[PDB]
Design a protein around this ligand. Structure first.
Ligand SMILES: *O[C@H]1[C@@H](O)[C@H](n2cnc3c(=O)nc(N)[nH]c32)O[C@@H]1COP(=O)(O)OP(=O)(O)OP(=O)(O)OC
Ligand SMILES: [K+]
Ligand SMILES: [K+]
Ligand SMILES: [Mg+2]
Ligand SMILES: [Mg+2]
Lengths: 34, 36, 149, 188, 128, 55, 111
RNA sequence: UGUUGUAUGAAAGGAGAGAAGGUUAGCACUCCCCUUGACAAGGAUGGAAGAGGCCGGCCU
């Protein structure tokens, strides 16, 4: 709804772990739920 | 209330709020390329 | 007499609802249903009409305009302001809505609201003419100090 | 079509016809509109209270029963109540305790009970009338509804002093011994 | 006696036909007599259905009553006579568990004081 | 939904080719174009096909 | 688990509703029409339980709707297979001897 | 203690069934139905609308 969320976000590898996808246990739990 | 199995059916047979358009500002068309 | 006139209402409505059911598209035709109520001077009809019409397409550019124009015409101002608010909410790149909102905030006489609207716009800072517009705005009133910021 | 116009149409239908059954239907509809509060005035403007009062005078028992039923729900309102009294229909109601049907008698009793006015406006009339003697037999009848009505009627239109005098008169008739008219109960 | 089921019939005829029968204040009661229930042991479902309308003081099935074969007769005591009228008004001639349902007023059963309050409330309503 | 049966085969082909050409018209025309002129482009498509058949 | 009712019950219901023309049965029309969906099942059970030629009367358990809309024969015809085979062999002998001895065998008219 | 809670078919009286000369064949796009067990097929090609802009009107 605001302007600041359409400007390009930082473009570099500040945090490899933060972008990494969740572990196998969480995805198996969500798979079983669904 | 109990319903007997024999009866047939009895009755004859806005979207989600609009998301804001988050767009780059439009570039107006030049007369040359509008001729194109 | 009068009964004939309500019959006139009803048959024109019936054929219009057929026309509307046929496509649900055709925005130019959507406006006509509304204006015919505007002639009939009963607005609640047109408020539901334009609500449905915004449901089909809010992306549209004439529709939000036309709605607010009917609002202005009917001299009812609080809803006109509020729904220009919602317009600028969901179409924040279209310049015209911003212009026709602040112009309105002037001629209706409420200085601060325009100020806040201008501040909100300062997020986007989308075009060159808009800034100039606000410069002229600020020189219109006693204030040159804000104009420096 | 229009409510009051519809009631007027029923009035016309009643007046022009002569078939007793097509009058049975009219007196049914009229007696059941008489139950309506709002339709009272509409009935008050069309002389149909006197239509009922004339209709009791007719000798078709079913029709008379219907007329009495119409009266029963109709009398209790103060305007209508006063009109009926002024007509002089009270002896017409009095004639109905000897009517053969149970319903008609009950309706008559209810109408009599309704005609009761505070401040002793009409009670005096009942004591003079022999209706009280008839009531004693009715109260001790086999019909539970009749018994309830008779007992209720006694409280509403009678007095303890009056009841004792009434009982004595009834007893005297059974006794077969005459009571002087001049003699009267003395307050203590 | 008065429980007999009268029969229907221009007079600006309505949608549903009505039998010729005038209702007097005395005729109407708060005791409602229901006859024609199928003998399939629905004692409680019928009573719940009627309790939907008002509040039921007392309900019992009176078996002495002469009824037809495999058919039942019941009594319902309501709390307010207007509730009894609406219960008749809507429940009468409603198909119930495969049977036609016939509700009639039962004034015989009500006692002297009950008649007193009935008549007095009729006077109260008519005056206003 | 109705299936595509032998009656409906050719009309369905034209119906789908029509829709796909329309999609590419929308993605091809520059932003803020004064007019769409889509119906005219589809008229030129028809005339091209008719000229193919007539050599 | 209820108790079977006397046959007079269903006989009286079927008798009363006959032809479904009385104005009193207006609400049973919907249920009769709704019960049409199961009438092939009722036909299947009826013909499945037909009496064998050596028995005069067969009495079957019946499950019937309370308005009289449909009646199901609620059983399965279980037989002992040797006894069953012997009974139809008995019929083979009797029917053959009867076709031999009956001078003129008249076949019944259909329908 | 009534009334607009609607529809089908028929009869009578009227209108008359697409194709820029005539006679016609159809299949669809949307939304309105009818027959039908329909993911089929029919109901006149089932019927009814169909370029752009401005406020039924006006302009190309
Ligand atoms: O005038 C009609 C009807 O309006 C009136 N009536 C029905 N229910 C009533 C009620 O609760 N109170 C009063 N005062 N009047 C009422 O009576 C006649 C005819 O009644 P119907 O609609 O035929 O119903 P019903 O009287 O029950 O018919 P019946 O043969 O007796 O039994 C089903
Ligand atoms: K079509
Ligand atoms: K054709
Ligand atoms: Mg077709
Ligand atoms: Mg043809």
């Amino acid at each position: 709804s605001k302007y600041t969320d359409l400007v390009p976000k930082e473009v570099m590898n500040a945090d490899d772990p933060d972008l990494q996808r969740p572990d196998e246990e969480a995805i198996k739990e969500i798979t079983e739920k669904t | 209330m109990q319903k007997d199995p024999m009866e047939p059916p009895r009755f004859k047979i806005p979207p989600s709020p609009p998301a804001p358009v988050m767009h780059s500002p439009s570039r107006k068309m030049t007369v040359k390329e509008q001729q194109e | 007499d009068e009964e004939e006139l309500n019959d006139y209402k009803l048959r024109k409505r019936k054929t219009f609802e057929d026309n509307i059911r046929k496509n649900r598209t055709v925005i130019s035709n959507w406006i006509k249903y509304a204006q015919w109520e505007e002639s009939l001077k009963e607005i609640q009809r047109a408020r539901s009409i334009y609500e449905r019409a915004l449901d089909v397409d809010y992306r549209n550019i004439t529709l939000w305009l036309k709605y607010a124009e009917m609002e202005m015409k009917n001299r009812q101002v609080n809803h006109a302001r509020n729904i220009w608010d919602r317009a600028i909410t969901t179409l924040p790149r279209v310049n015209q809505f911003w212009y026709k909102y602040t112009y309105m905030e002037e001629m209706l006489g409420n200085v601060a609201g325009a100020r806040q609207v201008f501040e909100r716009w300062m997020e986007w800072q989308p075009e060159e003419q808009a800034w100039h517009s606000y410069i002229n705005f600020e020189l219109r009133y006693k204030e040159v100090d804000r104009a420096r910021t | 079509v229009g409510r009051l116009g519809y009631l007027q149409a029923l009035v016309t239908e009643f007046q022009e016809t002569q078939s007793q059954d097509a009058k049975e239907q009219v007196l049914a509809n009229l007696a059941n509109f008489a139950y309506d509060p709002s339709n009272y005035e509409y009935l008050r403007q069309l002389q149909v209270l006197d239509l009922f009062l004339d209709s009791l005078s007719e000798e078709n028992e079913t029709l008379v029963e219907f007329a009495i039923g119409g009266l029963c729900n109709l009398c209790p309102d103060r305007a209508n109540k006063e009109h009926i009294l002024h007509a002089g229909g009270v002896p017409l109601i009095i004639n109905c305790l000897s009517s053969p049907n149970e319903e008609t008698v009950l309706s008559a009793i209810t109408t009599l009970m309704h005609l009761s006015p505070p401040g002793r406006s009409f009670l005096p009339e009942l004591t003079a009338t022999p209706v009280v003697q008839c009531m004693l037999r009715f109260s001790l009848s086999a019909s539970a509804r009749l018994r309830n009505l008779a007992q209720i009627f006694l409280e509403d239109f009678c007095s303890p002093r009056q009841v004792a005098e009434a009982r004595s008169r009834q007893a005297h008739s059974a006794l077969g011994i005459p009571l002087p008219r001049s003699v009267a109960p003395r307050q203590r | 006696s008065l429980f007999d089921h009268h029969v229907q019939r221009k007079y600006r005829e309505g949608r549903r036909p009505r039998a010729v029968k005038v209702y007097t204040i005395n005729l109407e009661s708060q005791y409602l007599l229901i006859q024609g229930v199928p003998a399939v042991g629905v004692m409680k479902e019928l009573v719940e259905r009627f309790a939907l309308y008002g509040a039921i003081e007392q309900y019992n099935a009176l078996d002495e009553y002469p009824a037809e074969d495999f058919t039942e007769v019941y009594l319902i005591k309501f709390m307010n006579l207007q509730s009894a009228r609406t219960a008749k008004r809507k429940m009468d001639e409603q198909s119930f568990f495969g049977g036609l349902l016939h509700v009639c007023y039962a004034p015989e059963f009500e006692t002297v004081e009950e008649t007193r309050k009935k008549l007095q409330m009729r006077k109260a309503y008519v005056v206003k | 939904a109705k299936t595509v049966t032998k009656q409906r085969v050719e009309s369905h082909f034209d119906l789908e080719l029509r829709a796909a050409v329309m999609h590419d018209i929308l993605d091809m025309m520059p932003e803020g174009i004064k007019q769409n002129k889509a119906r005219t482009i589809l008229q030129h498509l028809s005339e091209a096909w008719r000229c193919w058949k007539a050599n | 688990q209820k108790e079977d009712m006397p046959p007079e019950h269903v006989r009286k219901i079927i008798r009363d509703h006959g032809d479904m023309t009385n104005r009193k049965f207006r609400h049973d029309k919907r249920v009769y029409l709704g019960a049409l969906k199961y009438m092939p099942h009722a036909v299947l059970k009826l013909l499945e339980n037909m009496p064998m030629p050596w028995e005069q009367i067969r009495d079957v358990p019946v499950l019937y709707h309370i308005t009289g809309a449909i009646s199901f024969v609620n059983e399965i015809p279980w037989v002992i297979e040797p006894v069953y085979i012997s009974q139809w062999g008995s019929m083979w002998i009797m029917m053959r001897r009867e076709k031999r001895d009956r001078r003129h065998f008249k076949r019944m008219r259909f329908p």
